[PDB]
Coordinates of C-alpha atoms and ligand atoms in Angstrom, one line a residue:
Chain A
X8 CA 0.7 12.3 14.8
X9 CA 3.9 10.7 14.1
X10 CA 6.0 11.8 10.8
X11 CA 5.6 10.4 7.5
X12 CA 7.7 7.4 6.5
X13 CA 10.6 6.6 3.5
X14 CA 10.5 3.0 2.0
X15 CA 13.9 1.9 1.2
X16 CA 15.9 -1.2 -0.5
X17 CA 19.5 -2.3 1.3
Chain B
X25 CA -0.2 1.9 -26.9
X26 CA -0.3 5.6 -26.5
X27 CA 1.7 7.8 -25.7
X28 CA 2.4 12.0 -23.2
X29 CA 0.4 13.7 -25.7
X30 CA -2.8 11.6 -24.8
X31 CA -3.1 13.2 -21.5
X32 CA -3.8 17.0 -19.9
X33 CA -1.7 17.5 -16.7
X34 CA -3.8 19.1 -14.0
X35 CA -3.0 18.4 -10.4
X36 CA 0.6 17.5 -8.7
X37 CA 0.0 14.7 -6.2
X38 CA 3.4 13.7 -5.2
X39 CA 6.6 14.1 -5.7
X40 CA 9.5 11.5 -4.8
X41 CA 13.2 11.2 -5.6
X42 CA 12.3 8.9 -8.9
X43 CA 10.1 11.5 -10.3
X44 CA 6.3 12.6 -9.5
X45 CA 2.6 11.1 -9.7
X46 CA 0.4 13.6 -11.5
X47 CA -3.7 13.7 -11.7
X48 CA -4.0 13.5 -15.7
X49 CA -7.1 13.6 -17.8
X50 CA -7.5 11.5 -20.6
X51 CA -7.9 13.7 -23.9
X52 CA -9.3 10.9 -26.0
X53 CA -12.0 9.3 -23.1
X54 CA -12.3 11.9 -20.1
X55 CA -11.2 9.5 -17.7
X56 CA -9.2 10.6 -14.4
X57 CA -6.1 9.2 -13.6
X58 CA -2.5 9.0 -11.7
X59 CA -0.2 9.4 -13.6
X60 CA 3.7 8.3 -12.3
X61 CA 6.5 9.6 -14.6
X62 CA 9.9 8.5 -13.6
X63 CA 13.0 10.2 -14.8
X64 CA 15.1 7.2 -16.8
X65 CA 18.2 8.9 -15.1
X66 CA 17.2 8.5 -11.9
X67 CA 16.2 5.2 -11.9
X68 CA 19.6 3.8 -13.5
X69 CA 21.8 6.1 -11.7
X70 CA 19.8 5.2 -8.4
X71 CA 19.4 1.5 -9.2
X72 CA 16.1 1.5 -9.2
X73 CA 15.2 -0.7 -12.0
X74 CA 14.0 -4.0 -10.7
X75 CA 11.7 -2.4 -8.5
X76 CA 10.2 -0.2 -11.8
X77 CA 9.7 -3.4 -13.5
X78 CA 8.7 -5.5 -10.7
X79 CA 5.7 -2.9 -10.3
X80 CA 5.1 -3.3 -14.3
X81 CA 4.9 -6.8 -14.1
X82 CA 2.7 -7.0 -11.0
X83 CA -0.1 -4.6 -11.8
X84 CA 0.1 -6.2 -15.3
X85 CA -0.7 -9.7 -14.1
X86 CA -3.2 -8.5 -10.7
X87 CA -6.8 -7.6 -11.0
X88 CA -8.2 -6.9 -7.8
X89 CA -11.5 -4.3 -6.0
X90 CA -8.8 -3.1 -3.8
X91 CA -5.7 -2.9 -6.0
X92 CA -4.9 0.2 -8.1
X93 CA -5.3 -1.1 -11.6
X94 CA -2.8 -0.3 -14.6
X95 CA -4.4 1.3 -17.8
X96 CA -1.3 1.9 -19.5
X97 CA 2.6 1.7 -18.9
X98 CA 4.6 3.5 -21.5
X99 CA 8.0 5.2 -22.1
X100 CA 9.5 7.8 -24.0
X101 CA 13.0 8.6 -24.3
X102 CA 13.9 9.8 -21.2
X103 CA 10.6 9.4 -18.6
X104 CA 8.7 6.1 -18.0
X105 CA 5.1 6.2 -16.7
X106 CA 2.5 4.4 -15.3
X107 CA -1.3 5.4 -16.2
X108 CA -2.9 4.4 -13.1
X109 CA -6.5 4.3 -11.2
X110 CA -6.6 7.5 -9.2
X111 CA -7.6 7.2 -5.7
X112 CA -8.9 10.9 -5.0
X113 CA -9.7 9.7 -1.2
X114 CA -6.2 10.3 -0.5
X115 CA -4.0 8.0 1.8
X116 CA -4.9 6.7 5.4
X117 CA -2.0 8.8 6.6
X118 CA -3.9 11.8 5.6
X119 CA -7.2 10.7 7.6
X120 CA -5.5 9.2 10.5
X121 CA -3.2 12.3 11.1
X122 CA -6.6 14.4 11.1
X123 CA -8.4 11.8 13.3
X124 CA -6.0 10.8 15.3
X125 CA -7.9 7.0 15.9
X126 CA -9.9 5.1 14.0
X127 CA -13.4 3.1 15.6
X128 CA -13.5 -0.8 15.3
X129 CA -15.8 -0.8 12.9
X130 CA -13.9 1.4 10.7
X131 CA -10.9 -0.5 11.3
X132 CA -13.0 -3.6 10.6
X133 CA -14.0 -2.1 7.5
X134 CA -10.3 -1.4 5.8
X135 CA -8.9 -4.3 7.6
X136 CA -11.3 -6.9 5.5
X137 CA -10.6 -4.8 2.4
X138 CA -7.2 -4.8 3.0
X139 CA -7.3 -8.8 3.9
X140 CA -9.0 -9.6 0.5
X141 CA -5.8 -7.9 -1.3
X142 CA -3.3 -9.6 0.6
X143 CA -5.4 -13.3 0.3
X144 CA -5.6 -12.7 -3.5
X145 CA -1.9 -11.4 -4.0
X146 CA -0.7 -14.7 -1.6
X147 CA -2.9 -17.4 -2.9
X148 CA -3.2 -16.4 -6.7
X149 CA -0.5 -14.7 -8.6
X150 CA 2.4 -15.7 -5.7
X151 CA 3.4 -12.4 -4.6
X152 CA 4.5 -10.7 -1.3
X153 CA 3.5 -7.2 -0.8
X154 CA 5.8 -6.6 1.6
X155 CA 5.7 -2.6 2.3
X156 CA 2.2 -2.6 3.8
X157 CA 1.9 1.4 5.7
X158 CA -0.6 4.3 5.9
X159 CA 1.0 5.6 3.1
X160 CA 0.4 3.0 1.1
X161 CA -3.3 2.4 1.3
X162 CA -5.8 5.0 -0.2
X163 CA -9.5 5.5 -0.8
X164 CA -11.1 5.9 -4.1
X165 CA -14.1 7.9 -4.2
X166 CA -16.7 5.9 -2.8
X167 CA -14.5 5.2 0.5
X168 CA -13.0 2.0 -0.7
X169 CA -9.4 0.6 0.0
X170 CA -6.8 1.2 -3.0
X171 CA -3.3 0.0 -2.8
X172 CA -0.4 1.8 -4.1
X173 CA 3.1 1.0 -4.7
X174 CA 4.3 -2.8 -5.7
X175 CA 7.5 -1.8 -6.1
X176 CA 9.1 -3.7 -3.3
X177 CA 6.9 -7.0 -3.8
X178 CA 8.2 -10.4 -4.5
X179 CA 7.2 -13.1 -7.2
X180 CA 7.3 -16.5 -7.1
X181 CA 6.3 -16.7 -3.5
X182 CA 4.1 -20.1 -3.4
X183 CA 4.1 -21.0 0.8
X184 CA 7.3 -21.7 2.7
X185 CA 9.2 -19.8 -0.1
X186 CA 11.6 -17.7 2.1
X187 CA 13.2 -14.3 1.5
X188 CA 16.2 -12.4 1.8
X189 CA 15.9 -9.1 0.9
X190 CA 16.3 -6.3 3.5
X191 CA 13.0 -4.0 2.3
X192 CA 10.4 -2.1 3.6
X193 CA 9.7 0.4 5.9
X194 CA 11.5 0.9 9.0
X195 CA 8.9 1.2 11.3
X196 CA 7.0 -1.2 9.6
X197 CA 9.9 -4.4 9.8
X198 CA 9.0 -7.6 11.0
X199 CA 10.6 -9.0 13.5
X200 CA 11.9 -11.9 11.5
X201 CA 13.4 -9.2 8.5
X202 CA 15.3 -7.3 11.2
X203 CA 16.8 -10.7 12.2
X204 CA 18.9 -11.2 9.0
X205 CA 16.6 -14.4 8.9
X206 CA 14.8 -16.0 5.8
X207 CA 11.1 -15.0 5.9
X208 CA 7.8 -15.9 3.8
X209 CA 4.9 -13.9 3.2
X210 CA 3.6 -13.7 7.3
X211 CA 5.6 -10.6 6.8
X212 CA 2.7 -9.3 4.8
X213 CA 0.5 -9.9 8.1
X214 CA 2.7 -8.3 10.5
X215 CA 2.1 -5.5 8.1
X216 CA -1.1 -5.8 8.4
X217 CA -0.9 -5.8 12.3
X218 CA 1.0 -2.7 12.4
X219 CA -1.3 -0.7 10.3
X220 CA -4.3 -1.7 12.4
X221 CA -3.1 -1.0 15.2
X222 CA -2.4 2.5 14.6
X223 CA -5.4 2.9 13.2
X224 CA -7.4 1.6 16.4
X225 CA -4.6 2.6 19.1
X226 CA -3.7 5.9 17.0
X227 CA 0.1 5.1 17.3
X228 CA 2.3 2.7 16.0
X229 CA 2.6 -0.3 18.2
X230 CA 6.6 0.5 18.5
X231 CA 8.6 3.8 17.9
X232 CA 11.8 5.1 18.6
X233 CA 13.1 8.0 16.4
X234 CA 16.1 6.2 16.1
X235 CA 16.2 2.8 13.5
X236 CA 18.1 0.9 16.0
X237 CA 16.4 1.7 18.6
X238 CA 12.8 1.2 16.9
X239 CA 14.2 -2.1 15.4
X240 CA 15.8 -3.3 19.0
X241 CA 11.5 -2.4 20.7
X242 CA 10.3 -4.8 17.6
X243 CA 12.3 -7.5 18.3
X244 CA 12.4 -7.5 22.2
X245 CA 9.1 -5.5 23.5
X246 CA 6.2 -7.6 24.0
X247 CA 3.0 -5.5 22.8
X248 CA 0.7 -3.2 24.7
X249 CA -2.6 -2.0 24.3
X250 CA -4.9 1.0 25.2
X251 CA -7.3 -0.6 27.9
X252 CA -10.3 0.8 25.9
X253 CA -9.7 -1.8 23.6
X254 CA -12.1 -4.4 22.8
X255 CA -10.5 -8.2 23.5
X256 CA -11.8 -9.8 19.7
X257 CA -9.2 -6.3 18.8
X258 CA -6.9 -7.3 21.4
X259 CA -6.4 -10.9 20.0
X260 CA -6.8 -10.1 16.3
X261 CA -3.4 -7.8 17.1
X262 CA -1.6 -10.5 19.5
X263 CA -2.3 -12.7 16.9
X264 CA -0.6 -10.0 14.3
X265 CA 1.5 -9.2 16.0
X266 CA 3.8 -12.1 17.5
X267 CA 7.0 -12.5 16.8
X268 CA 7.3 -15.6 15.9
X269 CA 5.6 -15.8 12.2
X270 CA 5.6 -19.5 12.6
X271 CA 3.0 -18.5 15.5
X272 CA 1.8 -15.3 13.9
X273 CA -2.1 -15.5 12.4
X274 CA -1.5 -16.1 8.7
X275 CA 1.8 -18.1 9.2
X276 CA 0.7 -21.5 8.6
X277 CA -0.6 -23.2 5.7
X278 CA -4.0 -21.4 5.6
X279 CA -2.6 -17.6 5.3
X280 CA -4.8 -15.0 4.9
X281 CA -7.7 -17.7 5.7
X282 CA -6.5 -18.0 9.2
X283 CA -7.3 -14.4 9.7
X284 CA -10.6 -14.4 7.5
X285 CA -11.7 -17.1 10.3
X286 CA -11.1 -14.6 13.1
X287 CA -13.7 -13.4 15.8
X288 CA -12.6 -10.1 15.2
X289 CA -14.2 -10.4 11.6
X290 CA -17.2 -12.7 12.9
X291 CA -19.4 -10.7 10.8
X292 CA -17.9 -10.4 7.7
X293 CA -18.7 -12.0 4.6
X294 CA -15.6 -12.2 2.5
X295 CA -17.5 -12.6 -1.1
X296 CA -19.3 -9.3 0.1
X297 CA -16.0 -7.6 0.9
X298 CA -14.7 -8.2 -2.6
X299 CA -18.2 -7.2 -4.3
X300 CA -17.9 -3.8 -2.4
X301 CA -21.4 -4.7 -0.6
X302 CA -20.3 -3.1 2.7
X303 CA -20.9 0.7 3.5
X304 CA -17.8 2.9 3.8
X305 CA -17.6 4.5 7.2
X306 CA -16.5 7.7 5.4
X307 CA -17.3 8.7 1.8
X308 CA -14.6 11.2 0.8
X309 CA -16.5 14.8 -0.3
X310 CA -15.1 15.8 -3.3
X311 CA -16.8 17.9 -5.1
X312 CA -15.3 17.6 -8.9
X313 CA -12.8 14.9 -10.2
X314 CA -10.3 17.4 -9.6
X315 CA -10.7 18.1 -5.8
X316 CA -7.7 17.5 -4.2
X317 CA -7.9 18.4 -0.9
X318 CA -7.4 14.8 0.5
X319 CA -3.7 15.4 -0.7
X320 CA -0.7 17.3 1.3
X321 CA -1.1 21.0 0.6
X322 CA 2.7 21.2 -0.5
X323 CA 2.1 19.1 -3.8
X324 CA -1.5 20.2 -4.7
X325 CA -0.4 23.5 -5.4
X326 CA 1.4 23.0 -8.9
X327 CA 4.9 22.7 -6.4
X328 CA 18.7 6.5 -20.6
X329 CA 18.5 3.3 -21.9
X330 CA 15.1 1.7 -23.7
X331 CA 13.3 -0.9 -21.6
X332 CA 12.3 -3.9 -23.2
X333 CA 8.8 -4.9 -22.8
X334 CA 8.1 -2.0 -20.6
X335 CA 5.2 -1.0 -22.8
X336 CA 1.7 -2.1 -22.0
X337 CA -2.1 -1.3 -22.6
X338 CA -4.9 -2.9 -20.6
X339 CA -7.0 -5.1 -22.5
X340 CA -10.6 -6.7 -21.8
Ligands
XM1_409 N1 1.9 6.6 -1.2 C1 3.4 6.6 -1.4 C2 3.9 7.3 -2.6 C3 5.4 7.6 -2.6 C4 5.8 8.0 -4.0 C5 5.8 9.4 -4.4 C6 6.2 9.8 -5.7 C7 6.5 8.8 -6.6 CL1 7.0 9.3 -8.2 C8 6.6 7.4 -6.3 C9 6.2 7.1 -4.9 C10 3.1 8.6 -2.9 O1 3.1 9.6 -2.1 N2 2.4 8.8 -4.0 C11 1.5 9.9 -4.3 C12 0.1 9.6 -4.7 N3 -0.1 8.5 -5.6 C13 -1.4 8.2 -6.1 N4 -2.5 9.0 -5.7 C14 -3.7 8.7 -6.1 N5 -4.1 7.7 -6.9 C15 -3.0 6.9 -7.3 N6 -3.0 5.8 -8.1 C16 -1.7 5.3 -8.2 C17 -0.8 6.1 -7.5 C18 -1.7 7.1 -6.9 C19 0.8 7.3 -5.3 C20 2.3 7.7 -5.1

């Protein structure tokens, strides 16, 4: 279904 | 304390922009493991340090049925790895893409697994998982919850104790972290929320493509459910779900005991879920130790300073 995700830090 | 020569490299299970997670064998035992080897480059030049160690120093220090343990963590002169428990049931992303929904009960079933992670992480050791996602959650062989990734977790958490940092996963923020506000470990239980919901409604409970628009639906739209949903669901995800985390379940004093208490989970007994009495709704059919078909297709197919204290063997 919906497109895989990216973690991230500021 | 061993070293790269201890290991045969077999299967590619991910790559990422730090480096790549590798199946390995273990030449001296004939154990199967997951094997994360970071470029030392990368991480300085990309700033990733504190999160390498924060992940060294929380699977050191956790010991948990449902959290990947740490067999080793060593370094050479230009890599650093983590010898890891490998999950061959791939991630919830994979399953869910495939399925497209989740039943209840199945839901049930990772949600209490998932639960006794987050209680243990909260109430011992002080920690905040804080990047809770399909991605992040695997099976192991039996069907069981594993949980991957602590490299954006907090220490030193203890109740109230209130964070700053912007982290995560977009789609996964809380409310309260896309405020710039101060925020404590409910974060962990909108998390939670999120991930259940897609895996009962078979979508995330707010999307956008674009961040700002995705960020502006978590903030301001007030949820929606499919109207096949069962009302003890409904509630468990309302209760997730709010806004508010001084109103979301598991934002008072009691934590992950507030949702333990739960109609939704009426039937659950929580020493069970720890001692892996309950049956997996799906047992994962590998065939060997090597069978990788619960991983993208992409990956399976083979395609400086020192740190101080980075080095670590399990013990007994
Ligand atoms: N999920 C998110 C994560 C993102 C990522 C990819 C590569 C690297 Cl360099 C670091 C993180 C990922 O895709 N990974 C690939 C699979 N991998 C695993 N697979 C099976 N058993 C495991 N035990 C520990 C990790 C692990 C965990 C890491």
């Amino acid at each position: 279904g919906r497109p895989r995700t990216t973690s991230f830090a500021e | 304390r061993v070293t790269m020569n201890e290991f045969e490299y077999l299967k590619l299970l991910g790559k990422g922009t730090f480096g790549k997670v590798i199946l390995v064998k273990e030449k001296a035992t004939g154990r199967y493991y997951a094997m994360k080897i970071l470029k030392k480059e990368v991480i300085v030049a990309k700033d990733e340090v504190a999160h390498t160690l924060t992940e060294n120093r929380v699977l050191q220090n956790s010991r948990h049925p449902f959290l990947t343990a740490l067999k080793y963590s060593f370094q050479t002169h230009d890599r650093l790895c983590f010898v890891m428990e490998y999950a061959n049931g791939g991630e919830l992303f994979f399953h869910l893409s495939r399925e497209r929904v989740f039943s209840e009960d199945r839901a049930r079933f990772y949600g209490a697994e998932i639960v006794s992670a987050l209680d243990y992480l909260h109430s011992e050791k002080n920690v905040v998982y804080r990047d809770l996602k399909l991605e992040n959650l695997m099976l192991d062989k039996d069907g069981h919850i594993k949980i991957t990734d602590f490299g954006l977790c907090k220490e030193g958490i203890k109740d109230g104790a209130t964070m700053k940092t912007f982290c995560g996963t977009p789609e996964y923020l809380a409310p309260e972290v896309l405020e710039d506000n101060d925020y404590g470990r409910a974060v962990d239980w909108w998390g939670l929320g999120v991930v259940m919901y897609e895996m009962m409604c078979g979508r995330l409970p707010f999307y956008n493509q674009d961040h700002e628009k995705l960020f502006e639906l978590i903030l301001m739209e007030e949820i929606r459910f499919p109207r096949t949903l069962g009302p003890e669901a409904k509630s468990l995800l309302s209760g997730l779900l709010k806004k508010d985390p001084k109103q979301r379940l598991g934002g008072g004093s009691e934590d992950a005991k507030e949702i333990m208490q739960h109609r939704f989970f009426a039937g659950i007994v929580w020493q069970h879920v720890y001692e892996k009495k309950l049956s997996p709704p799906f047992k994962p059919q590998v065939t060997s130790e090597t069978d990788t078909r619960y991983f993208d297709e992409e990956f399976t197919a083979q395609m400086r300073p020192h740190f101080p204290q980075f080095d670590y063997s399990a013990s007994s």
